């Protein structure tokens, strides 16, 4: 199973962004999936009452898509990833470097969902202002953020990280439990991940994925000290050239 070190040495941020996050007019398997992610995080952060002071984004990677709706609902967003190269691609965009991956097609989409109330530039600035901290992360450590002092967060968020980072269920259950120590009692856990997947490709590079189904995930969540507000499962898959998932699940949980 892909080790931590192989995320430091082989995970290619720009490569990954190109492969998965170039909102393309040709209706790819990747595009449709992004569209669906975007719609859930909208429903969760805008339509529903999931809001608060502090959100912690677990396993951010180089990507900002999952923070776009959340920035409407939280004052303070911290972003975390295990890999230094990854945090460096984020910061590019945070700094609005002209070398930063181009997100406007995604920003366009979200602004639409929220009924065009704002424009790309004013959506972007909101996120920029919202992100206070960019930190090293390890979901396997009982203190994932290590030393860094943080108040208890209202919400922990994780998109397609926990599958990537957890070799087994024991460890997967440990990770959730670790995230929970950053969360208030009654705090929000929002996870979105692949169902029944063993690998995913960034270019030529193959990264492991923990193949778990609907049941195992829900079980792991209860064990870690959470109750599930809601749990969703969609058929849509990635291109066969890229991963072997059967679908995706989204959930909102609450800590005890
Ligand atoms: N032990 C660990 N702790 C924290 N993050 C880890 C980790 N092992 C891997 N990761 C991170 O998990 C991410 C999986 S890729 C998903 C990135 C982003 N959330 C998205 O939706 O596309 C990578 O950025 C990798 O650095
Ligand atoms: C964006 N993808 C696509 C994907 C598909 C399947 C499995 C996994 C992924 N992961 C992590 C695990 C990603 N980061």
Numbering used by the authors: 5 to 260
Cite, word for word, the article reporting this structure:
Nicotinamide N-methyltransferase (NNMT) is a metabolic regulator that catalyzes the methylation of nicotinamide (Nam) using the co-factor S-adenosyl-L-methionine to form 1-methyl-nicotinamide (MNA). Besides regulating Nam availability as a substrate for NAD+ biosynthesis, NNMT activity also influences the SAM:SAH ratio, or cellular methylation potential, and regulates DNA and histone methylation, thus being an important node in the control of cellular metabolism and epigenetic regulation. The nicotinamide binding pocket of NNMT is an attractive target for small molecule inhibitors. Here we describe a novel series of tricyclic compounds that are potent and selective substrate-analog inhibitors of NNMT.
JBSNF-000028 inhibited the human NNMT (hNNMT), monkey NNMT (mkNNMT), and mouse NNMT (mNNMT) enzymatic activities with IC50 values of 0.033 µM, 0.19 µM and 0.21 µM, respectively. Thermal shift assay was performed to assess the binding of tricyclic compounds [(6) = JBSNF-000028, (8) = JBSNF-000107] to hNNMT prior to co-crystallization studies. Both the compounds were found to be tightly bound to human NNMT in presence of SAH (molar ratio of enzyme:SAH:compound ~ 1:5:10) with ~ 10 °C shift in melting temperature (Tm) whereas ~ 3 °C shift in Tm was noticed in the presence of SAM. Based on these results, crystallization was carried out with the hNNMT protein in the presence of JBSNF-000028 or JBSNF-000107 and SAH at molar ratio of enzyme:SAH:compound ~ 1:5:10. The asymmetric unit contained four identical copies of human NNMT molecules (named A, B, C and D) and overlaid within 0.4 Å RMSD among each chain. In the active site, demethylated cofactor, SAH is bound in the cradle formed by loops (141Cys-Asp-Val-Thr, 85Asp-Tyr-Ser, 63Gly-Ser-Gly, 163Thr-Leu-Cys, 69Tyr-Glu) originating from the Central domain. Tricyclic compound (JBSNF-000028 (Compound 6) or JBSNF-000107 (Compound 8)) is planar in nature and bound below hairpin structural motif at the nicotinamide pocket and stacks between Tyr-204 (from Hairpin) and Leu-164 (from central domain). NH-group attached to saturated 6-membered ring interacts with side chain of Tyr-20 (from N-terminal helix), main chain carbonyl of Leu-164 and very proximal (~ 3.2 Å) to S-atom of SAH. The overlay with hit compounds A or B shows that compound A lacks the hydrogen bond interactions with both the sidechain of Tyr-20 and the backbone carbonyl oxygen of Leu-164 whereas compound B does not form an H-bond to Tyr-20. This could explain the lower potencies compared to JBSNF-000028 or JBSNF-000107.
